[PDB]
Structures are given as structure tokens and as C-alpha cells.
Amino acid sequence: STIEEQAKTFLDKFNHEAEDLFYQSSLASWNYNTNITEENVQNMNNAGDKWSAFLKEQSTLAQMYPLQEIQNLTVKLQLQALQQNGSSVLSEDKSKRLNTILNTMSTIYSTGKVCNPDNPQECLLLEPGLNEIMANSLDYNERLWAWESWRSEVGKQLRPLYEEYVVLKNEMARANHYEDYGDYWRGDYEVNGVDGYDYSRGQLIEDVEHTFEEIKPLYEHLHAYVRAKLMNAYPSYISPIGCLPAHLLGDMWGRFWTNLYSLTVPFGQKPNIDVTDAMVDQAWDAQRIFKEAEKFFVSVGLPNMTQGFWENSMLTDPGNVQKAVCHPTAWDLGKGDFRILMCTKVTMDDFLTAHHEMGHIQYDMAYAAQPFLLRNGANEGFHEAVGEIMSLSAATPKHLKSIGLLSPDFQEDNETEINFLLKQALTIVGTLPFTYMLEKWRWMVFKGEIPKDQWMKKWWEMKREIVGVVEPVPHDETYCDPASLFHVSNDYSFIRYYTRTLYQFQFQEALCQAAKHEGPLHKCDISNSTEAGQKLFNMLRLGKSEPWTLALENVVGAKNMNVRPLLNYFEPLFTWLKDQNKNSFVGWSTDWSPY
Amino acid sequence: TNLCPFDEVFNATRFASVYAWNRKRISNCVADYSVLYNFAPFFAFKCYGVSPTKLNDLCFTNVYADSFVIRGNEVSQIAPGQTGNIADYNYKLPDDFTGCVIAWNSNKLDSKVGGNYNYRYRLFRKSNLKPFERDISTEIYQAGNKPCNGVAGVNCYFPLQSYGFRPTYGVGHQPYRVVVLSFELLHAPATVC
Ligand SMILES: *[C@@H]1O[C@H](CO)[C@@H](O)[C@H](O)[C@H]1NC(C)=O
Ligand SMILES: *[C@@H]1O[C@H](CO)[C@@H](O)[C@H](O)[C@H]1NC(C)=O
Ligand SMILES: *[C@@H]1O[C@H](CO)[C@@H](O)[C@H](O)[C@H]1NC(C)=O
Ligand SMILES: *[C@@H]1O[C@H](CO)[C@@H](O)[C@H](O)[C@H]1NC(C)=O
Ligand SMILES: *[C@@H]1O[C@H](CO)[C@@H](O)[C@H](O)[C@H]1NC(C)=O
Ligand SMILES: *[C@@H]1O[C@H](CO)[C@@H](O)[C@H](O)[C@H]1NC(C)=O
Ligand SMILES: [Zn+2]
């Protein structure tokens, strides 16, 4: 009996036991989220504890195999997934310290109450009020006050915690045969052992920088346009050759520019295509919304929803009789059980949300035959890419006209496509530099290229160099600006939003070319096409059993990220922006300051 | 008139597990095969060696009826010349089968809220079974070079696993009752007609 046969037998037993055990935990979590009570919390906690204990005890037996004597790729991948030690190689007291640090950072961010000098008992917390006072506000002093106060209050309480967090995670990564914790994060895009599709952990940085170099000119033009319009909005506050202040971007951090559409609209007289009135006039409901999206997937050539999907899913708000979480979610409980949790209203946004969630569900159903540990996307950025490409084709005017939501007496105008493209670019292309700079900063901090006496200075000069955003007032080294974000204080990776954005348009262009589209890329529709559906299913069926480079070549025909489809998508807006930027300066100077 | 007792193997309160399947002999009676249509919705009604119509104009020495409960995914393995986890370790049909395999969904009887762990199947048998062999032995399976001393641990596994049927799985993982009828026409006078 060779060690490989023993590994296969162990994997069979583990698969059966894990498939039996994980369903109970998933069902308990669904029961708690659907119906919030006290017994449900206890049941969910017990199921989670049992699942975690089983996984730990199976990993402990899993390290028994050398893994150097296995010639089968599937067994090697499953054993590699099972054999990872995680946060257990380090000592026990250090583990308790790390857990306590994580918990205290999480609760500090969660509570984060902020008072005001106007009245001792007029405090505004983060999720209500502060987001409103930073998004829909127009006053300079008020939003400046909010931006300074929240960040000063939060960041001057997490710096000692964050330093110990960093050193403990670096120690754990070093004990796990990794250079640093940033390398531990980067290890998700690593493919080795397959000739012709070999990927290194260090190639990700080079590829990301190569893509950003091509991205930069369009961002510069959009930034110049927004700068001119916002200078028209704010008199005697924005230098024409300087950088945009941080607190004027419509968000606490500047992640999205989608709230700047009101100030920056090409042709404000023409309104965008809103369908809610047409949906209400025809007496639509949540059932009709989720039946018109199933037909979209059927017309492409993909399977339709199972019989239990309609019986078990919650597609309407239960009301005040019982409390449920309103966040839309696609649930894969396993053993052929797929559900969707959503509180659907009769609006146009819920149409696209339903399409996104059903795209998630179809992706989950695609690889239901794979082993338990190989039932996932090829990497962390394919679920969202598929969801967004599904929701992208259902918003075109042609699709709305086909389903009758738009009157046949309707023709697109050249003043509407530009406006729609700019509105979408304020959300899509306006977030790439932020994500890139944040992830680069955390990678540099983890690697140690930034000494502890240079955190804030390096942060706020990289912000000026890469993003083109200047701080309102100087911040001392006692501040922790990046910790204000949700994804920084809760130990989440922040690079999937870049690769996912690129994959969106790569997949969209591939499916557009497969469907014989004739016009521009922003009016493409994959409905009624079966070859595109077959080509997509060829990759969806793989799951996580093959390298993501091979899957990308299966769909697109290339083995690496490419930004050309995004530029093809945004070309008309780019030409219009170049046309309108004849009498303005493109670029910014970092030496200029507002203080 | 003396009719064969097809109401005892088709309509029974409880069936048997796959590894210990129930076999019954039928002889010296009059077979009314159209009665088998009293249920009506049948997930599988395959017949090998005989016409799709049952041809009530046939006489055989005796009939054998085998009953068990499997998943909906494993119904396709009950066929001559098939490989898998059920056709190799639990129940095998000969390459020259002459009989009919009937299978129907029984989710409302064999599934319970919280699990139904009364149905088991054999795994790691160490060798393929010959046609019509039972093997209800329960001993620790040894996959390795260190002998097991009668107890499980490391490379020593209990051969039988449970199904754990529940409502709200899906037709792939739902209970299915399977009855296999075989006709043995081998010498002697014919007593089943
Ligand atoms: C929610 O849980 C409570 C607590 O037992 C129960 O009484 C109620 O019936 C549940 N509601 C639903 C819809 O299951
Ligand atoms: C790896 O094992 C699986 C079954 O566990 C088998 O189907 C596959 O062919 C094996 N790989 C190779 C390259 O033979
Ligand atoms: C996991 O930790 C155990 C405990 O010493 C060690 O033997 C094993 O080599 C480790 N495996 C990996 C992949 O780090
Ligand atoms: C949904 O799937 C079924 C299952 O084959 C099939 O009849 C068809 O594709 C769909 N049915 C309807 C009524 O749309
Ligand atoms: C797709 O096919 C359906 C039915 O064949 C048809 O009604 C519709 O106009 C076609 N086009 C779109 C964009 O739905
Ligand atoms: C139940 O038994 C009757 C005979 O009493 C039979 O006609 C019917 O088919 C049985 N139901 C089954 C086998 O589901
Ligand atoms: Zn999503």
C-alpha cells in the first residue's frame, strides 16, 4: 500500500464526514439569520464549535502524509488545503494575545461613538448621521469637522494595538514558512507544479503595477474634469494646479466617487433611465422579479432553479413579527440545497441585485460535483466578476425594451450614453488607485520597508503621489489613518477589488466577441446566445480543481490580467473628456497644501 | 385463483439497508404484473432480457425480489456492467441479467427532520463482489502496513457509513426505494405464470 492510496482513503472518509457535518452548521446559520431568537444563537454556536473541532482534528491527522510522494494533482491540492496549520504554530499565550487584539480592534471600530463640541449630549455615531453628514452635505466646515474628528478619535486609540498586531502576524507568518504576512495574503494567486501555467507570489506586484501604468492617463483626465467641476462648486478653496482635499470626495475615506454625480453631470437636463414607475404601473412583485431573471439564464443555455429553491428561499421581508438580516445573500448549504435571502422591493436596483445573486447561485450549482475542498472559485475574484457581468447586461436599454419595461417609442441619444458612462466611471474607475495604494502601503509596512517612525508621513505622501489627494490639515505620528477603514481593522485582504474589476471586463469582452456584437461594448447583451453560455459554463464547471490561469485562458484566451477591455469600454467617455479638457491643466502638484 | 404476493415486497412499512439487502423467493402462484402500476409514478422501470411490456404470457420456474433504499444519484449504478461505490461493494448484477429494476422516490417516508441514520452502506470492502453476494460482515478495514488490533485509529476505518436523509436536500440526495425482479427459468416444471 503506497502512501498515495492511504491518502486517497483518508480523503474519501474526510469528504463523507465533512459533507455530513457542514450541512448542520449551514442550516443552523440560515435558521439564525432568517429567524433571530435566543435558541438559534446557541444552536449556531454549537454547530460552529463542532465543525471547527472536526476540522482541527482532521488537519492533525492530515499532516501525517509527506506530500512529496504524490503524483496526482487533485489529491495534492486537497492535501495542501487540509495540511495548513494557520494560527496554531505559535504559542498559546501569543494566540490569546492575538485574539484579544483582534477583538478589541473590532469592538473599538464597531462602537466608535463621537461627540460634538456644540452640545455634550449630541453625539453622532458612524453608520447613522456621520455617513449622511459626509455624503449628502455641501458645507465645507461641517464635513471638515467630521473628517477630522472621526479619524482623530479612532486612529489615536488603535496605533499601539496595530503595531502589536503587525508584529504578531509577522511572527506567525514567519513560523508558517512565509517571508511575511503580506506574502501569506499573496499566496492565494500562486500556481506551482504545472508546467506552462506557473505563477509566482512575487509576480502579482509587478503585474498590478504594469496594469496601473496603463490605467493612469484615464484617471488623470477624469481627475482633472472632477477638479474643474468641484472648483466651480467650491470657490476659493481648490487650486487649479493642486490636489483635491480628502473630505470633498463624498466619502469618509474616498473609496468611491459615486456621490459626486450631483455636482459633476455632463447634461443635467436629461434624466437617466429609471424603470421603477413602469414596474409599479404593471403591478410587479418580488415573485415576478425572480421569475424574469431565471428566463435570462435559461435563454443563455444554463440550468434553471431547482424545485426546492422556491420553497425554501425567503424573497420578501418577513415584517415586524420576526427580525431578519436584510443583507442579500446566496446560500449554498450543500447536498443540493441552494437558497437566496433577500428583502425585495419593487425598485430598479433590486432587479440588478436579483440578477447578481442568481449569477452567484448558478456559479455555485456549476461545480456541485467537485470534491468538498475544491468547491469554490479558482481564486478570490471570480464570484463577484460573474455576478457583475450578469448584472451588467440586464441594464442595457435593449434588454429593457425587449422585456417591455421600456416603451418602444424610445431612442438613445448621444447626450445620454456619455452621462451614463460618466456615472458608471465615477464608481468603477475611481476606486482603483485607492485600492492599489492601500494594499501597497500595507505590503510595505508588513515587509518592513517603512520604519515605524515614518507611517503617517509615507501614507500621506503616497496619497498625494498616487491618488492625487492632499490631506486637509497635518496629522502627527500618533494617528492611525488607515485603521479607520473597515477592512484594515478587521484583518481582511484588499486586493480582490482590482483583479475582480479587470476580470469583469475581460469576461464581458470575451462573451461579447462570442455573441457577434456589432456596436460599442457598453451596449452588448448576451441574451438569446448559447455559444457564450457554453463557453462560460466550460469554466464555471471547473471550480477550484485547475489553475486560474488555465480557466482564464479557457474563457478569454490569455493567461494574465489585461486592462485593454476596460479602456475599450470607457473609450467614448475618454474621447469626450479629452475634447472638453482643452483649456485645463492635467496633473497635480504634491507641494501645494491647504494649510 | 391464487395471486402472487406482490403487495408485501412493494408496499412494506420499512425496507432494508443496501449492504444487507432483502431477497424473497416467489413460486407456486399466479403473477399479476399490471398490479405493479398501482403506484404509477416510477423514477425507473428498466427491463433487460424481456419486452418493455411485461408479457404476461410467460411462465418461469421462480422469481426473486430484492429490495433496498439508495440515493437518487446511485440509481444508475443498478445495471449490468456498471462501476461505482454501490455496484462494487454493496450490490452487483450479472452481465447476463434477465429481469426488471424498478425505483421510485420515497422522500416522505425515509427522511426525517434532524437526520435518518438508520440506512447504511458499505465502503472500503477491499475487493469487488461477485454477482448476488451479500457480505454483511463488519470488521475493521486496514489500509496500511500496520495491522489493526480490532479497534479503529489512524489507518483503520469502520467499513459502514450512514446516509442521514433529511427533507430539503434535492433529488440527487433524496431516498429512493429500489426493487429488482429476476426470473429464473432453469429446468423443472414452470410454477409461476
Ligand atoms: C422563530 O423562532 C421562534 C422561537 O421558537 C418560533 O416560535 C417561531 O415559530 C419561529 N418562526 C418561524 C417562521 O419559524
Ligand atoms: C487522480 O485521482 C482521481 C481519482 O481520485 C482520478 O480520477 C484521476 O485520473 C487521477 N489523476 C490522474 C492524473 O490520473
Ligand atoms: C504544522 O505543524 C506541525 C506541528 O509541528 C508540523 O509538524 C508540520 O510540519 C506543520 N505543517 C506545515 C505545513 O507547516
Ligand atoms: C426549468 O427546468 C425544467 C427542468 O428540465 C425544464 O422543463 C425547463 O428548462 C424549465 N421549465 C420551465 C417551466 O420553464
Ligand atoms: C430573445 O428571445 C425572445 C424569445 O425568442 C424574444 O422575445 C426577445 O426579443 C429576444 N431578444 C431579447 C433581447 O430578449
Ligand atoms: C400499497 O399496497 C397496495 C395493495 O394493498 C398496492 O396496490 C399499492 O401499490 C401499494 N403502494 C405502494 C407499493 O406504494
Ligand atoms: Zn456578490
Numbering used by the authors:
A (entry chain B): 19 to 613
B (entry chain A): 333 to 525
The authors write:
Here we report the cryo-EM structures of mouse ACE2 bound to trimeric Spike ectodomains of four different VOC: Beta, Omicron BA.1, Omicron BA.2.12.1 and Omicron BA.4/5. All of our structures show that mACE2/hACE2 bind the RBD of the Spike protein in the same manner at the binding interface of a RBD in the up-position. The RBD is highly mobile and its transition between the down- to its up- state reveals the ACE2 binding site and allows for it to bind ACE2. To gain structural information at side-chain level resolution of the binding interface, we performed image processing of the cryo-EM data by location-focused refinement on an ACE2-bound RBD that was the most well resolved.
